[model samples]
Target chain A: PTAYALAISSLGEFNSLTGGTSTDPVAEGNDYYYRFEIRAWEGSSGPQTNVTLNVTRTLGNSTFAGSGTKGVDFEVELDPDGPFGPASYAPVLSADVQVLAWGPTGVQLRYLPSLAPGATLRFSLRANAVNGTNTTVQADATSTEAPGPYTVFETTTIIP
Target chain B: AYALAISSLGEFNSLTGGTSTDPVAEGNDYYYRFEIRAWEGSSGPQTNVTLNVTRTLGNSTFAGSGTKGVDFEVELDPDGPFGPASYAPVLSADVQVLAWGPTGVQLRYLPSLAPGATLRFSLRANAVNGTNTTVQADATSTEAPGPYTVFETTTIIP
Candidate 1:
């Protein structure tokens, strides 16, 4: 299968998402602010289904949101990312897409509907680092239409 | 539907990227490498790709003839992810009735190769038997509707 531009982009777009208004995770609004926007992508062959977006941190606190119908709902794996310990929070939502899971360890979202080509759905999240070490905020997306459950798209924003 | 199963390994017996370890150890007298690809240079993923291999020094001469240490061994060496990188065993089948050899050999695998991915394999032959001077390999696959073969000859150590 081929790969497309499935990604977790800028924080501004993350703010403009869910709740019908802009929201910020970092109160002080300093350079430490981190947000991500994940959009659905399809290949030249056909539609994509059972797509999942995952978010995690090396170390930090976080908030999440989404919009859409929920099917097979949020995934709450308390220790999926236990290597970092349980000091984080917030995995959030949108349509056939819903929060699969979120906790002090990690957060996630799954688009339950058949994601057709040309960008059909989207979601966002906010997080902040502990401010001392470089807290890495990582996000990635995977879909059934593309071979196996390999992370097809990924992005990283480190807390400086 | 694609011809990937049989055509993926088009350059098996005609490759020149082989190294000679003739005098080293058992099962490694002659080392060779070959690659497989999407049939007809198709632009996407190909499924159930596979391969079949034979030899000029058939089972009669190498294994059945009471010759020792003269069998074929195949290894599947999948391409490593790009970017300053690379990943193992791919041994399969024998020498003769009285001559014991390796059997877990796999020059072919059944999986979807990621785009730009390569299906490569390493083949080694211990033609240590005095009767063998030149060894040849014939490669084809299960999906050969067009009927094709690629062969390579390695002048063995013995």
Candidate 2:
């Protein structure tokens, strides 16, 4: 069985864009939002019956470097106006979002706007606390035909 | 609840009784020609089943980006057209005729033919229109036969 995710107005599950959202941080630009919903959920044990979500975001191309040298990870901040400070507008930060219920079916992640292009974008979810997780499971890399390389945004990491 | 399934039976033809040929696409029309024969040995009503003749762009046995070309009619007449003599398409894309033209079975029972009372039918696949410039093709099917009646389908195409 496999665990698949899909976004609106996108092509196949190969490197596709889920959905995006807009967050107003002191206002100005229009808000945009995106949602990534689990479309296919099947595993050895019927479905992903039980699981938790731990989402993180990183530059699709990690080779890029900055002052504080973000180091390929978020959550950890740097000096003020300092290098990769989490709050610093450079690859800014989106509020920590969480999932309360995940049935044996699918998972949903809502990403706000501020996490769009310039400021900061986040993605990547893990099947955290897999005590009740199923064994044989898989995921799809959703994608679209939009102009540009397949952007790195989020993923599903299965532990158990 | 009503369950549905698709199964392929045995199919044979008369006019074009030889092996199948690759669907030919000339100009803007696609042509598929085949012959078929039908008869009931010594059984009761064959089976309440709706008969239809359809075409697939490519082999349905395997996976490829081929569309269901078109569906045609299957006549139960023993002396009449026997079955859809032809199914032409207005447009086509690598489409072919997989099912024999008279490939159908939609009667309360196949005419209780004796041991060898067979009807030979000729089938032809062509473009839907002789003028349209589009490249689209589709299949056809007849009405339902009866409730909860499992029908058998047969084909003989190379």
Candidate 3:
């Protein structure tokens, strides 16, 4: 299965639902919404089980919170659509969610059920540059199925 | 008493997390992540677990500077709260200075990975820009009775 860990803390057209990460510059001290997209390849192996998601950001000066989705450093909402759509990817899927870790720093959450063969899970997180350093945010995803624990991670920096 | 598997999530782009097999405009900076997760299915400790990396796409070995190629880094774990520092950074620049290694690198002939733990040993590629590249990994170790191995391929691009 394939996993995408795109993260952006800006407002560019692509930051919209259909595009990728926006390359917009961020100013220190400003609050931004970091959107992350996660998915399993269309016709891969078995249903990806115990898929866990993690978020780590520049330590100390940068603080994160959930948009009413407390415990996590950010809010999470599946794409307002479903798996069978314009792209044939499921944006709306159902699974029990668990918040493993979150706080003044990173985030770790797990999907209790399993990601069916050909589906996608997207997430959005809110954070602020509490002080003055560039926050290099990263996202890590792991597949805990027997075909294996396929681990994927991606990182991007916010220029202040 | 070990269950191990190595797999790759090829080149990927977009802020939405799409695979390189599909397109959505990602400029420069190629990414690839692969791993070998050891689940101690039995009560025995697995020892001499080894990992070997070899270049499969470049002209020769992995070179340091050039449009003649790219610069790549292998980070052990991004999940560590202290980045690659929670543990020691593996496959550091000493391994990067040139010679991408068909005979590349070996991380073994050492300690035993404990039992009943879900231990994930992973590495990721970070490059400013690049074309497509491939690498192969073979992981194995001794169970006191000696040798076991798992091989997987990784494809990366910009």
Candidates' TM-scores?
A: 0.31, 0.18, 0.41
Off by over 4 Å in 3: A1-23, A58-60, A67-95, A146-160, B1-158
Model 2 interface CAPRI class: incorrect
Question: How are the candidates ranked when ordered by TM-score, highest leading?
Answer: 3, 1, 2
Candidate number that wins on DockQ, 2 or 3: 3
Sort order, lDDT high to low: 3, 1, 2
Q: Please write out the lDDT profile of model 3 over residues B1-158, one tens digit for every residue.
A: 34433333343432113433211122334333333333323356566555565654432233233211133333333222212333333434223233233225444524344442222233323331222233455555564321222222222223
Give candidate 2 regions above 4 Å deviation.
A1-160, B1-23, B28-41, B44-50, B58-112, B127-158
Best by TM-score: 3
Model 1 segments more than 4 A misplaced:
A1-43, A61-95, A128-134, A147-160, B1-158
State the lDDT at A55 in candidate 3: 68
- Which candidate leads in DockQ? 3
| Per-prediction DockQ | 0.01, 0.01, 0.02
